[model samples]
Target: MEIVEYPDPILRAKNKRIDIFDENLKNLVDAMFDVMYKTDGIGLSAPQVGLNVQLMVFNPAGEPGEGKEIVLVNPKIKKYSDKLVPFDEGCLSFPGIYAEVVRPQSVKIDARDITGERFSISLSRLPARIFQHEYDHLEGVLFFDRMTDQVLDSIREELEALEKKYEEKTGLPSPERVEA
Candidate 1:
């Protein structure tokens, strides 16, 4: 599977919850991890690869066997810490664009594993940041949507360039940009 870039309709499409828990689901998770690592991404979501499903994978360590590999299926944020933090974030789908996005310092989430076993956990720091980024994808939200207006203006040219590139390559105009 390949990462779907910005301006692609799939990246903005609503995702459906995953209901099947079988060998195929496990294999798809593995494949998603492979693609994530290959793209040097610490987190990846189903929409990034053109699969509109509520699934995400991440490893805060950004390398195999270094940190826990997390797979969240049909994940839901149960709660979010009041403390907020700003961190520079990047998404595989957006390629070179990076911006400081503010997010909660921690979150409690309930999700299913590859085996469809339900679990609840709280995460913080890098892990939480990555989880939030990927979770936004599951909700049809992009990292830029969380950026401050000033921060977003700083990257507008690059974003427009990406939009133009997509239009030129696909001969289809990108969907209208939503207000940040």
Candidate 2:
């Protein structure tokens, strides 16, 4: 899977729900974790790699399959706590931009496992934050849009730098998807 950069039209597209639970889907998710680990990312959505599916792979601990990693398919926020907390958020899409964004302190999510079985989990702190971040990608929402004006303004040049890097490579304004 290719971890496409921001401005890649695929990154701005809303992902589709996964309907198949087979070896192909499983293999793709596995490859996603490898790509994510290679980039030192915490959470990644299918859209990040140009798959356009409502699936995400995340590991708060940065380990691939140590039981700490999670695969969420078609996840939905069932409920969220009233408390809000701020955390420094970054995206694999927006490589160099990080900002403090405030979100619900806790959340309950309904999701599916790799095999398409249903499950529900209550998550808090970092896990909750990353899940929400990945979920946003499924809706074509980039973390940069969630950033405060001050933080986004500071990263404007960085965004342009990446845009040019890809434009030079793809002959388009965005990076073409690269595959593993």
Candidate 3:
């Protein structure tokens, strides 16, 4: 599996729920974690690697053995904190782009583990931020979509550059083309 970059239609496509947990799923999760670490990403979703499934892997420490490694399958946010905070976030799909995005300070999440066992947890701070970011990928939400107009504009040129590269490489218009 390879990282699917921005403007790739796979990134915008709907993600299906993952069922049939098996050794293959376990191996896929392991491969995803390997890619995430190689890319120095704290979070990665199935769609980022061209898998349209509700699966994600993350490590707040962005390194092995430093932080807890989390594998979330078919994750759903049960509740979100009322308080909102803006934090600078980046994505493996977006490469060098970073921007402040406002999100709930905490969230109660219900999800299945790689073994298909259900679990619930409340996360805050960096963990919460990473979870929410990766969760959005399952729903075909890009980080730039969470950005305000001003914050998005700050990265407009970079986004356009990606758009241009995507169009040139694929000979297809970006999904953002008609929207913008």
Specify the highest-TM-score model's number: 1
Q: Give candidate 3 misplaced runs (Cα > 4 Å).
A: none
Give the Å shift of residue 103 in candidate 1: 1.0
Q: What lDDT score goes with residue 147 in model 2?
A: 73
Compared to the true structure, candidate 2 yields what TM-score? 0.86
User: Candidate 1 lDDT, tens digit per residue, 1-180?
Assistant: 477998888877889999999988888889999997788777888998889999998788888778778899999999999999999998877788889999999999999988889988898998899899999999998888899889999888888888888889999876745333
Q: Candidate 3's error at 60, in angstroms?
A: 3.2
Instruction: Give stretches of model 2 more than 4 Å off.
Output: 64-67, 173-180
* Top candidate, metric lDDT: 3
The stretch of ten residues in a row with the least summed lDDT in candidate 2 is: 171-180
The residue pairs found clashing in candidate 2 are none
* Candidate that beats the other on lDDT, 1 or 2, i.e. the better one: 1
Of 2 and 3, the candidate ahead on lDDT is 3
Please, what are the lDDT tens digits per residue for candidate 3 over residues 31-80?
Answer: 99999888877888999899999999878787877988888899999999
Clashing residue pairs in candidate 3 (N, C-alpha, C atoms within 3 angstroms)? none
TM-score versus the correct structure, for each prediction: 0.95, 0.86, 0.94
